[PDB]
Amino acid sequence: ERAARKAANKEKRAIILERNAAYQKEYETAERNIIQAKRDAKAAGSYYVEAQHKLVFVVRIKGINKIPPKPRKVLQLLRLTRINSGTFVKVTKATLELLKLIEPYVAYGYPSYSTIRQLVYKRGFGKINKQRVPLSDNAIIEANLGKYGILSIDDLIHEIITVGPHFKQANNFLWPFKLSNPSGGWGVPRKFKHFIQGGSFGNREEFINKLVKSMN
Amino acid sequence: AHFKEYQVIGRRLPTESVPEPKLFRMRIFASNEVIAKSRYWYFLQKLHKVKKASGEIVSINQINEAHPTKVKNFGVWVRYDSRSGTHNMYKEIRDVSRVAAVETLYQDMAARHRARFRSIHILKVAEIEKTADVKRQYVKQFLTKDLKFPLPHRVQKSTKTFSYKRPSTFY
Amino acid sequence: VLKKNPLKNKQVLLRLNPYAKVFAAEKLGSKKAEKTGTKPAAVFTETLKHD
Amino acid sequence: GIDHTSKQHKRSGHRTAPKSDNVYLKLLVKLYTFLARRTDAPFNKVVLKALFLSKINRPPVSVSRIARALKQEGAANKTVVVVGTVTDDARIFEFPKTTVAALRFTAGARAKIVKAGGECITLDQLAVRAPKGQNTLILRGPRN
Amino acid sequence: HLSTYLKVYKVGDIVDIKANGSIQKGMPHKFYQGKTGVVYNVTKSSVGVIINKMVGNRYLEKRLNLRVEHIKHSKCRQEFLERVKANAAKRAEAKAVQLKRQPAQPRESRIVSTEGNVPQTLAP
RNA sequence: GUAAGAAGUCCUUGUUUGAACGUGGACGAAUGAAGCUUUUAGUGGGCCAUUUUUGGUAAGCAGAACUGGCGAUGCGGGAUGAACCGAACGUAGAGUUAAGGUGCCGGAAUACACGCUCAUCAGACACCACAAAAGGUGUUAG
RNA sequence: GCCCUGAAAAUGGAUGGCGCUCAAGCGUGUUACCUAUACUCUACCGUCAGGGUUAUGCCCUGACGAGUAGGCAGG
């Protein structure tokens, strides 16, 4: 009976390793092909534009006092209930209007696979009816989101970054990330201006990786 | 911060009726691509009828100086909508790069006029190839033959609190 | 009872993501790229440098 | 701070135990807590919820109401159940030979049932007869 | 406008109330203007219309009679019915998908050419 | 204001040239997470701030409409302060920060860089908020 | 742009004080640093919820903790 348990474990483990190798191949060939497309446009004298980002990561920057009701409600909706809490969101028009509303109180941007992996590994906590369960094992994900074929934490990272059919379900399973304040600091002396005016909030589009890597 | 020069191009978004629109280009001085693109749209809204939602950027690129060790005499056009209708300024800066010229220009404007980044507009930075096109006297000062000058007051930075020497500022 | 973190503790890292072993063997992050020589266009370098 | 949304530290109500001090009733709820926890039958959870109720919310149920329930189709031989109290009724003259289980019977109601032929039973005996509530018919009295 | 009389209105249809000034008879309902209600019964001279009017914080139901001159067919459900029929067709094709709606997505990668359109540099 | 579906769509013929009911067959934007009574405390024309708008004149200002806060509220900063900035509280430890700051008082660079300024009581947050409209052979850049 | 004047009385007096003049002042930029009952991690107390178990108890898990008038509960 224990041999049967170990056999099932070994089967699922081999499945995980082939899936993860496939995902690595996918990511490397995708980025390499984008690079070669840019180079081909340059050689032909044409210009190549990359696809607009579809995922963004958002971090709360302002406390709870003296927040107006509409951004307060929007932050409730996006589960940014406290300072430095954070979530992934899929960007469409409907979400861009929300981000426009909550720009003064959040810093958001376009995240990297490295920071997504680091977040989901170090601060990755899941919801099992409730409760913010730490992940700690691929079984906890294969139970809940095996309905959607996500048998592993890396499969979950893939469904997140490659925004998939079940991004909503995976992200809602993911508890809002609890982050610290950055170790190097925020840089700027005053936070509550835009990123452009020597502040911190608003969209910065690539340095959110640096910021969340300092904060995590 | 320490500025950089960025090439930017904008496409304003195609339609039926109008495929392949006219690709307006600009040169920007800025710390990073975000600020560069914001400034691009800021100038493009003034020049033409475009919008960040109504348009798109094609190719952000960097421009490095072709000879960043050759010393040069730059002439800069500047304007700033103050206090009257807008009025222009010509300044001359002896430096190695357009980036350094623009940085020291912004600092000099902030010092001598209390005029700010938000207030300032860069029209054209241009190297002056030939001498005798240099107009300003403070740049003419430094083009003379076999120029020499001393530094008569030397004051030495001291790492300690106390000294046993009655120090000297010589050269 | 205690949360142990991957990115340290290779044992709990390998509990998850068993691809990490061959990842570190082939090293797959110091990986070299196939070389090419696709030169750019005269129009490109022109419109970059000026006018 | 957290900026709460759900009025933290809610009590949920729902009467986890009875206000009574009857030790026998406490034996009954101690039994039905085990049954409702281990059986998976819903009948036992219903009975356990009903045991916590008050006198105002446990109205009496009449012999005539029981006879109405037994006049239903395919429901004559079911073991009828009233968690509360069962009263007599001199308005009905003919009564079935049914089985019935309840906490408290009145003397006249017990006599009527025994006379018709049936038996009067307690909830623990109902448990050792029909744990999951198989072939049972629960009744409740008019609240208002 | 005679086309406001060759207009069948069956029980179930949805109509907006927009009363025109040109007919003094049956000018209804000062604030029932640009408000939509389905028709419950019809007589001559007449059409029924029901509206959910809110008082306090509950929607009560007000039924009413109106002349045909003021009411108008609603184009409220045009895209709804079009999408339902297209969904039936797409479900048939699947049986042989994302028939659901989706907001505006981020535009994908592409290539911009320079054949006669060289980029035009300029300044303030 | 209304709508964004299984209380919805599509085949099946008895009752005013046809309508309604009825018979049976095939199948939907995003994000986030209950309802019903019963009953009674205290408060029920008080103070501050922002922005919308009507009327305003020596100047101020008076009326209404939201919103936020104090009242009930401690903590860090502003030398001190009910309503300013940050941030809301269980008891402890380690780390990182906010706002504000780093000559000494006072924990932290008498740090780096570019300029300007000498005031016979300079200045050390401003506000074409007041003195107010200018004057000056003081200085710098246009 | 900075500087002087651009009127204001009357106990002795305050950029908070000392005092500061290529500043310890004005403007701007680049870093490092100090630091809260705030954020992160851990333990402990209590409450709440969810589970398990022949015992208004025992065990597991998690999220939370401001407070006047005033209300409820345990002592």
Side-chain angles (χ1 to χ4, degrees):
Chain A
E1 59 286 19
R2 161 155 189 171
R5 166 147 51 75
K6 297 284 177 195
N9 305 144
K10 207 162 273 159
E11 287 177 291
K12 272 178 278 183
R13 210 165 174 73
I15 290 164
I16 289 162
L17 187 123
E18 64 183 317
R19 279 192 186 192
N20 297 19
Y23 297 161
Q24 174 61 13
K25 215 143 172 285
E26 170 171 6
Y27 303 155
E28 74 183 4
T29 192
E31 67 183 318
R32 277 285 132 195
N33 288 3
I34 287 155
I35 290 151
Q36 221 71 52
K38 281 185 202 180
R39 284 173 176 167
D40 287 7
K42 286 216 294 180
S46 169
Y47 292 102
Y48 176 88
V49 315
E50 210 187 4
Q52 295 207 121
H53 303 87
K54 27 182 67 54
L55 183 71
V56 313
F57 187 72
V58 198
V59 173
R60 177 100 173 239
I61 298 302
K62 183 95 183 179
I64 58 170
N65 286 284
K66 305 192 185 227
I67 302 285
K70 197 183 266 179
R72 186 154 54 213
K73 177 57 174 179
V74 171
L75 290 165
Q76 286 166 10
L77 289 177
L78 299 167
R79 310 194 285 159
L80 305 174
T81 67
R82 56 169 111 215
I83 176 154
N84 281 323
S85 42
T87 37
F88 298 105
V89 304
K90 190 195 191 343
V91 48
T92 78
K93 182 66 70 171
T95 47
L96 277 191
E97 288 281 316
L98 308 177
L99 296 167
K100 280 172 181 176
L101 276 174
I102 63 168
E103 252 179 0
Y105 320 101
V106 307
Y108 58 103
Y110 312 133
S112 158
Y113 178 77
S114 189
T115 173
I116 294 158
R117 163 156 176 285
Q118 286 182 0
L119 287 171
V120 171
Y121 277 39
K122 172 159 166 184
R123 303 194 114 85
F125 283 68
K127 198 155 63 164
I128 293 171
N129 315 348
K130 279 317 176 270
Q131 305 218 320
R132 190 181 175 253
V133 175
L135 297 181
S136 175
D137 195 280
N138 281 309
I140 281 150
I141 291 151
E142 181 226 0
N144 296 261
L145 301 163
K147 301 162 67 167
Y148 320 118
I150 300 154
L151 271 37
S152 170
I153 196 174
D154 267 284
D155 299 15
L156 178 132
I157 292 161
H158 173 265
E159 209 81 340
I160 287 287
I161 198 179
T162 69
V163 173
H166 305 288
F167 174 86
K168 161 165 227 184
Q169 294 85 336
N171 209 41
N172 197 254
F173 170 75
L174 272 180
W175 199 271
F177 300 94
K178 284 157 77 90
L179 303 168
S180 185
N181 301 23
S183 182
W186 299 89
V188 305
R190 295 188 88 240
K191 287 164 67 179
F192 306 113
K193 326 181 171 162
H194 206 268
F195 177 71
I196 284 149
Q197 306 186 328
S200 43
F201 72 74
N203 201 342
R204 38 178 91 200
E205 308 192 46
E206 287 298 333
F207 305 93
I208 199 89
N209 305 292
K210 198 188 170 190
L211 198 88
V212 303
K213 282 180 190 199
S214 48
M215 288 166 68
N216 168 34
Chain B
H2 202 45
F3 291 104
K4 313 183 190 73
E5 225 186 294
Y6 286 127
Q7 184 217 328
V8 201
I9 298 160
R11 181 148 176 278
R12 172 222 312 160
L13 266 151
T15 42
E16 305 295 346
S17 76
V18 184
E20 201 67 79
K22 306 302 293 173
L23 302 209
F24 310 95
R25 163 175 185 282
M26 297 188 71
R27 287 167 80 107
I28 302 291
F29 279 94
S31 323
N32 54 67
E33 313 286 32
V34 171
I35 288 145
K37 287 182 278 204
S38 46
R39 293 289 247 158
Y40 183 81
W41 292 124
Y42 174 81
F43 292 119
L44 213 72
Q45 282 197 43
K46 277 193 159 66
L47 289 162
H48 303 137
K49 176 151 274 188
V50 196
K51 200 175 272 269
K52 194 169 141 74
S54 188
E56 44 161 320
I57 64 102
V58 169
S59 185
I60 194 92
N61 291 89
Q62 205 176 335
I63 299 157
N64 304 325
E65 208 88 31
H67 304 295
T69 57
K70 198 227 174 300
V71 179
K72 296 185 275 286
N73 307 313
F74 290 93
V76 308
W77 265 355
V78 175
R79 54 208 282 150
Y80 42 110
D81 313 78
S82 323
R83 212 103 161 167
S84 210
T86 193
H87 69 279
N88 290 11
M89 189 186 298
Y90 173 75
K91 283 177 138 290
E92 307 198 359
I93 286 152
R94 194 161 166 75
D95 221 325
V96 194
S97 56
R98 307 165 67 83
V99 177
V102 167
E103 192 186 4
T104 200
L105 172 134
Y106 274 111
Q107 295 299 120
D108 193 74
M109 293 300 295
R112 285 193 156 102
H113 300 79
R114 264 57 175 201
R116 267 86 157 176
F117 182 88
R118 48 153 208 252
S119 287
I120 291 151
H121 277 220
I122 292 280
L123 275 186
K124 216 167 69 62
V125 191
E127 185 196 321
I128 291 156
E129 291 288 341
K130 296 184 171 52
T131 325
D133 281 66
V134 193
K135 300 283 152 261
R136 293 282 184 254
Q137 213 79 37
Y138 51 71
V139 197
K140 239 163 174 194
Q141 207 153 228
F142 293 92
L143 317 186
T144 325
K145 194 71 164 286
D146 297 336
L147 180 59
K148 317 180 169 183
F149 54 91
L151 302 171
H153 220 87
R154 203 192 168 163
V155 305
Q156 288 300 149
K157 189 73 172 303
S158 200
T159 189
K160 305 182 85 180
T161 295
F162 298 113
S163 194
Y164 306 77
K165 191 181 263 283
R166 290 299 331 190
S168 287
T169 183
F170 70 102
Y171 219 63
Chain C
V1 309
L2 181 61
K3 173 154 170 86
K4 295 193 162 152
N5 181 25
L7 323 168
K8 315 145 136 162
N9 205 327
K10 284 162 74 192
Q11 304 296 317
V12 59
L13 167 57
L14 285 162
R15 191 198 293 168
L16 329 178
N17 199 321
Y19 184 53
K21 201 216 184 165
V22 74
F23 189 101
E26 302 179 40
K27 300 274 212 308
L28 294 213
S30 323
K31 178 156 189 187
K32 301 184 82 177
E34 169 54 21
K35 268 176 56 46
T36 53
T38 39
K39 287 289 203 73
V43 65
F44 170 79
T45 187
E46 198 200 306
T47 188
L48 173 131
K49 284 195 180 178
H50 216 65
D51 41 53
Chain D
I2 296 98
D3 197 49
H4 302 289
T5 75
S6 266
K7 184 155 213 162
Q8 299 226 322
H9 322 119
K10 267 179 189 167
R11 219 169 287 191
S12 202
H14 292 166
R15 273 245 183 170
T16 65
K19 277 209 83 96
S20 173
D21 39 338
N22 198 340
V23 66
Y24 300 131
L25 190 146
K26 278 174 163 198
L27 306 181
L28 283 171
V29 307
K30 201 174 118 181
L31 178 127
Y32 275 94
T33 38
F34 185 82
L35 287 182
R37 177 176 95 232
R38 295 260 290 241
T39 37
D40 89 325
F43 167 91
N44 292 339
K45 294 167 172 86
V46 155
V47 172
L48 182 81
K49 277 178 144 63
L51 283 169
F52 305 134
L53 290 180
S54 303
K55 187 185 201 291
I56 201 96
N57 289 327
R58 283 191 288 89
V61 160
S62 173
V63 171
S64 52
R65 205 171 270 275
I66 277 157
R68 275 229 201 291
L70 293 165
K71 297 249 192 176
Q72 287 168 222
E73 211 167 351
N77 296 54
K78 278 186 159 103
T79 290
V80 75
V81 177
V82 198
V83 177
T85 300
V86 173
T87 54
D88 199 351
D89 208 321
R91 298 174 287 185
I92 191 62
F93 314 93
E94 298 294 327
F95 183 66
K97 197 211 164 280
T98 191
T99 313
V100 49
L103 277 179
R104 258 175 290 262
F105 292 84
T106 58
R110 186 174 251 124
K112 203 178 208 98
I113 292 152
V114 165
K115 187 183 160 230
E119 201 210 315
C120 304
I121 300 104
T122 66
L123 296 185
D124 56 316
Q125 296 174 245
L126 182 77
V128 316
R129 284 189 200 212
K132 304 171 152 58
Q134 45 265 61
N135 211 46
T136 49
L137 195 78
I138 320 187
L139 301 171
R140 294 189 275 191
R143 186 62 56 85
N144 270 79
Chain E
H1 205 216
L2 215 76
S3 99
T4 37
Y5 288 96
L6 298 309
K7 305 280 272 220
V8 162
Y9 291 105
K10 299 230 264 179
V11 289
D13 313 348
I14 170 158
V15 279
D16 323 281
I17 296 155
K18 192 213 79 175
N20 65 329
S22 317
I23 170 63
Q24 215 269 3
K25 191 153 279 289
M27 264 177 195
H29 290 57
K30 37 159 199 315
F31 74 97
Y32 286 16
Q33 282 282 19
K35 289 197 183 186
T36 70
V38 309
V39 46
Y40 62 105
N41 51 24
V42 64
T43 66
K44 66 181 284 304
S45 79
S46 69
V47 301
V49 171
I50 310 201
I51 302 194
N52 315 118
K53 189 164 73 165
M54 93 187 297
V55 175
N57 274 306
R58 79 169 80 92
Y59 299 110
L60 61 149
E61 195 175 352
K62 289 290 221 285
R63 64 185 153 135
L64 186 61
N65 38 44
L66 300 82
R67 304 296 303 280
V68 80
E69 301 106 23
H70 306 301
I71 56 131
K72 159 167 84 203
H73 260 307
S74 165
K75 304 182 60 46
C76 160
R77 317 214 297 149
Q78 50 103 73
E79 183 254 325
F80 181 41
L81 272 304
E82 184 165 25
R83 193 161 33 77
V84 170
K85 301 283 261 183
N87 284 354
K90 298 150 177 188
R91 187 174 284 257
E93 192 66 16
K95 209 148 277 171
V97 277
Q98 189 81 168
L99 35 50
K100 294 208 193 201
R101 313 190 269 187
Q102 273 288 335
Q105 308 304 145
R107 52 179 161 269
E108 309 91 311
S109 98
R110 63 170 78 97
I111 300 154
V112 197
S113 181
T114 78
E115 296 185 350
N117 195 175
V118 189
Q120 195 195 346
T121 178
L122 75 186

